[PDB]
Design a binder for this molecule. Structure first.
Ligand SMILES: *[C@](O)(C(N)=O)[C@H](CC1CCC1)NC(=O)[C@@H]1[C@@H]2[C@H](CN1C(=O)[C@@H](NC(=O)NC(C)(C)C)C(C)(C)C)C2(C)C
Ligand SMILES: *[C@](O)(C(N)=O)[C@H](CC1CCC1)NC(=O)[C@@H]1[C@@H]2[C@H](CN1C(=O)[C@@H](NC(=O)NC(C)(C)C)C(C)(C)C)C2(C)C
Lengths: 304, 304
């Protein structure tokens, strides 16, 4: 029993983290086969970051300007390109610890593990959700850039996030491993707005199922509701509208609890309308939306 | 910026996890040098667990009754003993992936990372606190027994916890790596009470410092207080009494925020007396006590 925010075990990603240095900027790189991936703003001075022309800045740089270090071992750069907002540094040495891997662009509301790194050394691992507004609420200090988000499928690491920048709330924006930002952000230090951020309704339901499975049932009331009716309560409380895809995704949890999704929506409506009256659900005094149905099924039926 | 419950990177511990099988019971073992450590109740049938005589039960067992598997590799057992509530299985093969390690007994209020494992395969990693009543609030399904808690100091893994049992709230009890339970618990399926559990006051203060460092300051009020005066508010709210050791431990955070500990206590008193009035601190609608000052300094000044 018990329900915690759990990250994937990070070992397979630890073996891929390197330090990348150009001028005095140091950040983290991801070393897979004979290619090191990092944020392209590694080539910028503090001044450059205000309005950088990355093509012109990159042109001043040659292979030998890029100090790539794996532990206490210097890799030799034999090629450099920019793909969108990532630098790819081609090295002579394939990473002998390269796991089976893929690059995936994750969808809003999906979760991933972050291996927060400094100077190419892993400090810590935690679980994050891609918010509907394509930010994450991470823990990222100066040095953390190029730290990566991932999922593990069997023995296969799916890399989905590289850390680039912090936005004015203490929220985080970054790219996929092809260097495409999640959201409207650009890698320039100028005014930029994250959208209004909605609650991942299907995640909150999954978490209420998690609460039921773990014996927290108090919020389970006498009522039911309709897709139309709940989705009207959702709109008012800045929750994302629930679809039949969502109802279908909740099937395994529904079937494990013998609680119809629409009953669970009725409980949710009453929590949104009445609040929680000083009580807790899985030790939280708030509705939690950073667990996918997948994460709940994984944790509550224990897959490796 | 940002503040999250972060676990140590788990790679060094992943390489130590094995599967241990006796009769039809399977759980996790920790393989260090030529010794595999697991919970001794691996030798029990469901019936045995009610009132086991571990000495007599162990006597029915020989080296060959113990199926130790590292991935798809069977280790050969050349010795077995019981130390307190752990079995030590001596194997022919030293773990080639043995990290630099120590066994430590942690104190109440200290944190550690759990690598939750099933059939000797790591599923996930999360951060836990040894509660004042020597339980933990983990995520542990059938199969999780022998999963371990640890800290990483430099390159040195300090193992501090092995998972043994679940108590009636969905709370967890286990041993150090010498097989001594934390708390009054025994490895028998019979009525057992965890003490009343107090709040780790020094941890809550560390977390309020974390909140200030990250710009959440609203709870910072005009008042101050005394050690005696706050500790009287603490007693009433089931908080552990704050000592000068605690004030001294909060020094680095005090000095980083230029906020006197006793002012921060005054804010805490008002939160305990008035509650939070529907507001949040670092995205929590509750006072968080599972971060040590150490964890706050680590995260908020980024050590690897
Ligand atoms: C990483 O590059 C790193 N070296 O680790 C770094 C992390 C942050 C945490 C403080 C430094 N990211 C940046 O430096 C990033 C690079 C410049 C400016 N960056 C920012 O993150 C800035 N954010 C920002 O200007 N946000 C908007 C665009 C105004 C909303 C900081 C003000 C936090 C430095 C670029 C290219 C975006
Ligand atoms: C591990 O052994 C394992 N195989 O992974 C297991 C984990 C729990 C989660 C369901 C099984 N632990 C036990 O089986 C443990 C072994 C027996 C009974 N155990 C319990 O955890 C029981 N708790 C319990 O009886 N608690 C008290 C003592 C009544 C407060 C369960 C009821 C949860 C099975 C022993 C030796 C304690």
């Amino acid at each position: 029993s018990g329900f915690r925010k759990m990250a994937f075990p990070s070992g397979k990603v630890e073996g891929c983290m390197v330090q990348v240095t150009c001028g005095t900027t140091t950040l983290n790189g991801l070393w897979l086969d004979d290619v090191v991936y990092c944020p392209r703003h590694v080539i910028c001075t503090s001044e450059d970051m205000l309005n950088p022309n990355y093509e012109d800045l990159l042109i001043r740089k040659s292979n030998h300007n890029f100090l790539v270090q794996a532990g206490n071992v210097q890799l030799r750069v034999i090629g450099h390109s920019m793909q969108n907002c990532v630098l790819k540094l081609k090295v002579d040495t394939a990473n002998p610890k390269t796991p089976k891997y893929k690059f995936v662009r994750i969808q809003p509301g999906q979760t991933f593990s972050v291996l927060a790194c400094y100077n190419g050394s892993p400090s810590g691992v935690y679980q994050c959700a891609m918010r509907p507004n394509f930010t994450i609420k991470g823990s990222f200090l100066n040095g953390s850039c190029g730290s990566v988000g991932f999922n593990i499928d069997y023995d296969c690491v799916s890399f989905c996030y590289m850390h680039h920048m912090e936005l004015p709330t203490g929220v985080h924006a970054g790219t996929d491993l092809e260097g495409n930002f999640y959201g409207p952000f650009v890698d320039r230090q100028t005014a930029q707005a994250a959208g209004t951020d909605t609650t991942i309704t299907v995640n909150v339901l999954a978490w209420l199922y998690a609460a039921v499975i773990n014996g927290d049932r108090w919020f389970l009331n006498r009522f039911t509701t309709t897709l139309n009716d709940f989705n009207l309560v959702a709109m008012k409380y800045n929750y994302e509208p629930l679809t039949q895809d969502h109802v279908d995704i909740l099937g395994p949890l529904s079937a494990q609890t013998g609680i119809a999704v629409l009953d669970m929506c009725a409980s949710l409506k009453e929590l949104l309308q009445n609040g929680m009256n000083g009580r807790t659900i899985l030790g939280s005094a708030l509705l939690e939306d950073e667990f996918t149905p997948f994460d709940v099924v994984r944790q509550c039926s224990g897959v490796t």
